[PDB]
Amino acid sequence: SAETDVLIVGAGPAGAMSATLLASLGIRSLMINRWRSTSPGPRSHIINQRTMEILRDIGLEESAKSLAVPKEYMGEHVYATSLAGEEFGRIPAWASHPQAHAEHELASPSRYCDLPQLYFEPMVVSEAALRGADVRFLTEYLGHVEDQDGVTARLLDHVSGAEYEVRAKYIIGADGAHSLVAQNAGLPFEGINIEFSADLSSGDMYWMFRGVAALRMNKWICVEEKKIIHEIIGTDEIPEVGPISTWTINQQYAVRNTSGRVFCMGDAVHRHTPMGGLGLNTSVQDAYNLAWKLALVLKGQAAPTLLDSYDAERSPVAKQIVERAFKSLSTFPPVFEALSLPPAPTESEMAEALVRLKDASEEGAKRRAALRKAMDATIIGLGGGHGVELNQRYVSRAVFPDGTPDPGFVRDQEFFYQASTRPGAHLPHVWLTENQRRISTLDLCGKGRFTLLTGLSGAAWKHEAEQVSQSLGIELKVCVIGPGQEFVDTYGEYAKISEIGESGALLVRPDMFIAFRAKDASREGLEQLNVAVKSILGR
Amino acid sequence: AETDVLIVGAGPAGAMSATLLASLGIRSLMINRWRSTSPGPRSHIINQRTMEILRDIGLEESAKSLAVPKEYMGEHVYATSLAGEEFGRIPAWASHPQAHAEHELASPSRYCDLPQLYFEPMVVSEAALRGADVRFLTEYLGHVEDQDGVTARLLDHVSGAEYEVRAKYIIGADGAHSLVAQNAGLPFEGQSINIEFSADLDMYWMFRGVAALRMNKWICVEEAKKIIHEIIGTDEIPVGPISTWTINQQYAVRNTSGRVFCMGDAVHRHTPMGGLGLNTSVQDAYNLAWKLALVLKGQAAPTLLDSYDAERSPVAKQIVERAFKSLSTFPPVFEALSLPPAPTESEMAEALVRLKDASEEGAKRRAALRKAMDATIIGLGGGHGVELNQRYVSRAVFPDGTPDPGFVRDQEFFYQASTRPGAHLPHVWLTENQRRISTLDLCGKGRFTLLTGLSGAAWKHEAEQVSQSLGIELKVCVIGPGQEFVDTYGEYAKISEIGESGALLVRPDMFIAFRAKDASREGLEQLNVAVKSILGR
Amino acid sequence: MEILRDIGLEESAKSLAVPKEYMGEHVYATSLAGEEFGRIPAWASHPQAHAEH
Amino acid sequence: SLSTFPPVFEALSLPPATESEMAEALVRLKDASEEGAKRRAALRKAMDATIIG
Ligand SMILES: Cc1cc2c(cc1C)N(C[C@H](O)[C@H](O)[C@H](O)COP(=O)(O)OP(=O)(O)OC[C@H]1O[C@@H](n3cnc4c(N)ncnc43)[C@H](O)[C@@H]1O)c1[nH]c(=O)[nH]c(=O)c1N2
Numbered sequence A: 001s002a003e004t005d006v007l008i009v010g011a012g013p014a015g016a017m018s019a020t021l022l023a024s025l026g027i028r029s030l031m032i033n034r035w036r037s038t039s040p041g042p043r044s045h046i047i048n049q050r051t052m053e054i055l056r057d058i059g060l061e062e063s064a065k066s067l068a069v070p071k072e073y074m075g076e077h078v079y080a081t082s083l084a085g086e087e088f089g090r091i092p093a094w095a096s097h098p099q100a101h102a103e104h105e106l107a108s109p110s111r112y113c114d115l116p117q118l119y120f121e122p123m124v125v126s127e128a129a130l131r132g133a134d135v136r137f138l139t140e141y142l143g144h145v146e147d148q149d150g151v152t153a154r155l156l157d158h159v160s161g162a163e164y165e166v167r168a169k170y171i172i173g174a175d176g177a178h179s180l181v182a183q184n185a186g187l188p189f190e191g192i193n194i195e196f197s198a199d200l201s202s203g204d205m206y207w208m209f210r211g212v213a214a215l216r217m218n219k220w221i222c223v224e225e226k227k228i229i230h231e232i233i234g235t236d237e238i239p240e241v242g243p244i245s246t247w248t249i250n251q252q253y254a255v256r257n258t259s260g261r262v263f264c265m266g267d268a269v270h271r272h273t274p275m276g277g278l279g280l281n282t283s284v285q286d287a288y289n290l291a292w293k294l295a296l297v298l299k300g301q302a303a304p305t306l307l308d309s310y311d312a313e314r315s316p317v318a319k320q321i322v323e324r325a326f327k328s329l330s331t332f333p334p335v336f337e338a339l340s341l342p343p344a345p346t347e348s349e350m351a352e353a354l355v356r357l358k359d360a361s362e363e364g365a366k367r368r369a370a371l372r373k374a375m376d377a378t379i380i381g382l383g384g385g386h387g388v389e390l391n392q393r394y395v396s397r398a399v400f401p402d403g404t405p406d407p408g409f410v411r412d413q414e415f416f417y418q419a420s421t422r423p424g425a426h427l428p429h430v431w432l433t434e435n436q437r438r439i440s441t442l443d444l445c446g447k448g449r450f451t452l453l454t455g456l457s458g459a460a461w462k463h464e465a466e467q468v469s470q471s472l473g474i475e476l477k478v479c480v481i482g483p484g485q486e487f488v489d490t491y492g493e494y495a496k497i498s499e500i501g502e503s504g505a506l507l508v509r510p511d512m513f514i515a516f517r518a519k520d521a522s523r524e525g526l527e528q529l530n531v532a533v534k535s536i537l538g539r
Numbered sequence B: 001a002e003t004d005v006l007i008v009g010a011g012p013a014g015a016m017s018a019t020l021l022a023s024l025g026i027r028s029l030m031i032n033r034w035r036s037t038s039p040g041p042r043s044h045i046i047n048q049r050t051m052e053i054l055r056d057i058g059l060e061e062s063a064k065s066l067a068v069p070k071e072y073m074g075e076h077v078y079a080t081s082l083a084g085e086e087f088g089r090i091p092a093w094a095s096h097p098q099a100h101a102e103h104e105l106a107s108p109s110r111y112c113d114l115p116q117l118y119f120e121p122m123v124v125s126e127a128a129l130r131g132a133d134v135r136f137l138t139e140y141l142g143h144v145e146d147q148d149g150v151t152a153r154l155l156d157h158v159s160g161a162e163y164e165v166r167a168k169y170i171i172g173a174d175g176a177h178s179l180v181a182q183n184a185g186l187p188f189e190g191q192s193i194n195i196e197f198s199a200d201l202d203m204y205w206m207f208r209g210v211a212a213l214r215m216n217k218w219i220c221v222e223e224a225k226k227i228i229h230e231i232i233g234t235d236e237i238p239v240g241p242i243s244t245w246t247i248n249q250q251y252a253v254r255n256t257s258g259r260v261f262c263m264g265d266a267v268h269r270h271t272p273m274g275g276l277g278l279n280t281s282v283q284d285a286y287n288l289a290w291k292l293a294l295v296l297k298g299q300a301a302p303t304l305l306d307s308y309d310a311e312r313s314p315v316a317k318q319i320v321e322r323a324f325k326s327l328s329t330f331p332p333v334f335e336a337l338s339l340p341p342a343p344t345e346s347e348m349a350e351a352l353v354r355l356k357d358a359s360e361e362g363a364k365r366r367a368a369l370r371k372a373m374d375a376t377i378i379g380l381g382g383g384h385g386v387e388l389n390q391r392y393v394s395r396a397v398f399p400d401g402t403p404d405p406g407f408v409r410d411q412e413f414f415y416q417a418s419t420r421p422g423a424h425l426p427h428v429w430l431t432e433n434q435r436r437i438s439t440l441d442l443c444g445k446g447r448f449t450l451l452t453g454l455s456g457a458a459w460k461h462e463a464e465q466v467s468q469s470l471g472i473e474l475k476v477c478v479i480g481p482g483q484e485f486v487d488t489y490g491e492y493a494k495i496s497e498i499g500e501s502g503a504l505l506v507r508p509d510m511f512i513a514f515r516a517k518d519a520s521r522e523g524l525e526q527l528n529v530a531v532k533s534i535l536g537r
Numbered sequence C: 001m002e003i004l005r006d007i008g009l010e011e012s013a014k015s016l017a018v019p020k021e022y023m024g025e026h027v028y029a030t031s032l033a034g035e036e037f038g039r040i041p042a043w044a045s046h047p048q049a050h051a052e053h
Numbered sequence D: 001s002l003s004t005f006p007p008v009f010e011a012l013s014l015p016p017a018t019e020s021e022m023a024e025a026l027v028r029l030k031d032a033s034e035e036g037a038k039r040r041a042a043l044r045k046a047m048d049a050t051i052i053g
């Protein structure tokens, strides 16, 4: 028998990030994993800005960057018949087009990077243990029972062969795409990788229309006597040929992610195809949504109803990414159609298409233009979906509305990020300075606590926040941004992005979402802080 | 539970043993009492032998990405305090151009500064990935040995349960108060407050007797921590975590008892001068693992394991005595300033004014101070010979009849390459498809390798016979023009000390076990007898 | 270079030049595509020569 | 320093100036005999002596 506050079943990105955050917040956790090691395979490698912002908040962004390939080396996607064959063209993937890159820089202090899951996992798992989480591998969750005060789970130890029980206040189901935890909580659902080595002496990612195969990276992956590798390369005048692995995926999202004291996250609540690099990133963001809420509830600073916001905020995103990843698959077949090929052409059919594509006729021109259109429409799955990645819009009892209408989106909300300071949107990034060194708005906030941002004519917020803090027993850090202060609006970018007057305030949750906005520091405005915070905390 | 090897401890020694044993196809269970890898500032100087090991197993590039390269380690400063007067500087970690050349010539690898805080998780994750079972919050309580194996009792600090593990061997990698070594009855001979802090202010030695300062975040070596003031030393700038290390200087005279092998701090406990501890501990593991693997696979006799004590015990004594002796180089600095070992602020102020005296007496003091500062270098990068000049004598090294050539220059300060059996294979650059590759990169990977040139082609057939007969892999590399590996710079011919048709047999740990002068019939016939002798067969 | 340094042109010279790290690989061959006889460390590129430099 | 180049041709057993003669020299330089090892060593020695220039 063991006892903990939270039992975390699974030590992939979702579980390991939950353990790390809970341990940083002073909460006792036990994280288990069935297997001997972290994940070995080529799996994820695209890390998006929201994940990198989370790592930045907890102090792991610089270690992530030292293991990763920066964004400048991710842009060249090549569409071809094979590596040696004819190139159809290229596309600027991962926001490498100058305009896309500007939109990227404006959105976040962080950037895309290429960091194999193979490295990402042990980095976060070692951090969880260092910060205080108990971590135990070769240990399998078999089931649990729940009562009025907690949960009791049965675990099988694969080193000793012993079974034992663990008693917890809450269980996190971070146990992947066939989650037993989710099955036991009764959650409702709706909806070949080949490593090899070779010297390819004679861009960053190749899409081969052979229907579609992918090739990247001495060591290579494409997606046992594997002369699929020939064909893709495609010659046989060069010669390894394994390890080989498979992923069966059945597209489904949990409609609800919570049942009593059980919270599921990650692939356990969203299972989808890998198009867009959304899985690991969304899974880490699920953890970041939940952990601070658990910590407040366990410390008695919030009522248990604060936990209802997890489902209300993260379930819509589960459905969104599943549908989006699926839709992005449909953008590849039109490439074959533009060449006047069927989805699985013969060698003779392909050969004819290549000659036809170079024809000096009007028919040839029509095909070249159609091919370019089709290739351009794949970018939604390969870096174009910046809006999908960033445009979270939360509606829950952990976001206190300010009475303003939803302004919607000026441009397409899938392709383009739109900054907003309305409650329910992520705090916008802009550069300020601290001692003449650039610092992001995001660097003022987070660290497991609420933060209130204002300017010099909003000095009354400091005292108002101290009262609410004292009264509710919760930390509220106040930052008064302006000339001569600790943090300075050196570029004028804060006044430009805040959408409110200098004396207004933004209350920012530990996960960086705006929970309350006030237009000014009038007595009526100031009195609302205490009512918003009580409402957010269910008190 | 049952495993081939139980590894008690997951520091550098244990984690490296687990990684190597897993890479060799051996089942192991590595345990650690605590929840995490080591949190503290502890080791940070990684030497070339350790970096070579990481290179052999494919972790050198990951280590380098986490580390600070050698170009940022050289500036050691001797002073009264950070804001006070500087006595002078010394080129530490082989940063002087001549020391740097000697360093480059010795190895494909380089010093780097890599905190143990990052080193440990990198190796522990690799061990699990490659097949080791790894289990933290698990404590070794004791064991009993019989003629077929060992049975250990473990306490699980998650479940509170005790259970037993059955193994063929136990590795005691359990640190400076090793319970394993105490239970194996090993005989021993031979006779710091670290303060982290943050402040807005490469290495400072403060003669205040001596304090060190390095690195927003700083370490020097809880409101009484205005020791930090004094060292900085002002208080016009605005104090934990604090930690202690007791070390009692001791080395194990023997490192093995029956089926128990101890390694690392468990067999060599010493002061931190010279950055020898972690490095020596990783090298103990690299000596043992391939031997254990051959024995467990039935390709070597159990007597191969006797060479672990014969090769590694002399190193244990050597580093303990060396680290201690380097401490004695600091007090002469106070003596050159004509100060007592703990001077007052007034006495030191007077020493500083005398040190600038425009007389012949002042010039004598300036020269004496320089001489004393220069003699500290043996503990701060000067001991390249100590780091690299391993000379093994054992049944796992087959002598070639030649006398020991000794050392032309001082064997502590200077590395001397040798290809005589019992010395480390020398590094030189060859090419493979016009890309530079080290001699070391031809060898290792858990197996024996035989190196020769084009007139030594007969070695290929001889090695095949021995390999087939003994059931062991022997990779043969024929170095020359038109071959897979080419002597593009001529450096192999220059370093090998034998004719082109001679051969060097290199062990999995990169030590030379056999050398042949030529490929005559008498020379070729010796291979099989050397390999049998090395394997105890 | 010492002369250029004395008169204040060394940094301009360096901005126009290729540094010493890119001068060492001298290759002896029958032709560029043919067989290579071997290489030599030119312009003090051997580590000992570089130290002396 | 000019006089250090001709010993390279001599180590290959070539005269100072045909394509056939050179082709033979490259095959002999890979010869597995003790004579081939002598030629490889002589060639290296000759190449090394050009470093003065
Ligand atoms: C080919 C490919 C390529 C990509 C991606 C997937 C695939 C298949 N993804 C998605 C990503 O790999 C996936 O979404 C994450 O691994 C999900 O992380 P989780 O922590 O939810 O599950 P994960 O599956 O990673 O972890 C589940 C954990 O639970 C453990 N477990 C299961 N049952 C257990 C039990 N009963 N008891 C104890 N432990 C148990 C498992 O052992 C494992 O540790 C991605 N994403 C992205 O953002 N960018 C990208 O580029 C890609 N690319």
Ligand SMILES: Cc1cc2c(cc1C)N(C[C@H](O)[C@H](O)[C@H](O)COP(=O)(O)OP(=O)(O)OC[C@H]1O[C@@H](n3cnc4c(N)ncnc43)[C@H](O)[C@@H]1O)c1[nH]c(=O)[nH]c(=O)c1N2
Pocket: B008, B009, B010, B011, B012, B013, B014, B031, B032, B033, B034, B041, B042, B043, B044, B045, B046, B116, B138, B139, B140, B141, B173, B174, B175, B176, B179, B194, B245, B263, B264, B265, B266, B272, B274, B275, B276, B277, B278, B279, B280, B281
């Ligand atoms: C301040 C300072 C600074 C330096 C150094 C030391 C110190 C104190 N060193 C030396 C270096 O840190 C030391 O030599 C190594 O950590 C030794 O590694 P081990 O694996 O042998 O022991 P280590 O002590 O690292 O690990 C022992 C393991 O066993 C575990 N354990 C103990 N008893 C157990 C039991 N009964 N059951 C289960 N687990 C148990 C412990 O929890 C731990 O995992 C160094 N070296 C260097 O090369 N360069 C440098 O710069 C420095 N600097």
